[model samples]
Target: GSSGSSGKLRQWLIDQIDSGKYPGLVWENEEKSIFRIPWKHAGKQDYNREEDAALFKAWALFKGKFREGIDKPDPPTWKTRLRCALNKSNDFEELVERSQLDISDPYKVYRIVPESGPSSG
Candidate 1:
């Protein structure tokens, strides 16, 4: 029964079990946990204009190289530096590096001012 097409399927299953493949099912939940990534650290919030540009650059570099994704500049996908920038959140300030490229008014977070072209020049 260990050597023939008739027993091949059954023998294959037995081989799989004997190889601990069946017993590995016990850790399926644990394996599933590996996939259940909770972004509690800094995966929340949105990026500002300058941050978005930096993120785009970092993302470009990361796409090309896998060595240092977060080491370049601003850690991409870690959003909402406003709280950290304005010194509002005491929990974790400096969440995102406030850049001079983004000169925004604190009152209007949603405001987007386009660059003036030929301002009576």
Candidate 2:
């Protein structure tokens, strides 16, 4: 079944990440799980649809200017920093969506940089 196949594939991906098969491209940090953006194509239809929708919504909210620069770095609070990062990421998702790009493919290159990195390619 497709569901079973997807599950197996997901598990395989997890194993690969745990095994560190992807160098410089994967980061299994506490704040974030494995950086699976580039591997989005490996995921099943359900997962991709759900995640893409979520990212789209986030992008809309961020572009709407709901929240920006509301957080301070010295204290390092949870809500503010998280929102800021999510907002920026959403904006990126919007651009990708607009361009009709396949962000899921491994060959589709993307740079992993700090929050302050440039947005345009």
Candidate 3:
């Protein structure tokens, strides 16, 4: 968010950063956790477009399959998770390797459910 277009998600990320979730984000020690914010990975405004755009595209793919709107069993494998992160034909190994996920990470196959119980029954 050092400088870029405005939007809800962008604002939200800024808000979270301003709050506390990413204190070092303003610093240079803490590594970015997702989408390579503040620089999209290389740590500069110049690279934000290339990586973040692809990240947005890939995450949207994640939402399509990961969001609760749909109900279906999921395939278990890093390749399955990486499927939407690439284009029609690219360097499968390079892209897959670029992905932060691994073949056996249990999180890759788990549903993102609420952590706490309902406030009221």
The clash count of every prediction, one per candidate, is 0, 1, 0
Task: Give the C-alpha miss distance for residue 39 in model 1, angstroms.
Answer: 1.3
Residue 47, model 2: lDDT of 48
Candidate 2 residue-pair clash tally = 1
TM-score ranking, best first:
2, 3, 1
lDDT of 3 at 96: 30
Strongest candidate by lDDT = 2
lDDT of 3 at 37: 25
Please, what are the lDDT tens digits per residue for candidate 2 over residues 1-121?
2443332222343344456544433543543333443323334544444333333333334333334358322212323443355345432333232222344344222223445656655
lDDT of 3 by residue, 4-118 (tens): 3443333343344445543123311243222212222244555544333443433334334344346542323323443443232122112232333433321121111123634
Alpha-carbon TM-score of each model against the true structure:
0.17, 0.23, 0.20
Number of the candidate with higher TM-score, 1 or 3: 3
lDDT of each: 0.29, 0.37, 0.33
lDDT of each residue in 28-81, candidate 1, tens digit only: 133221111012233445634443343333333433443454664444332343
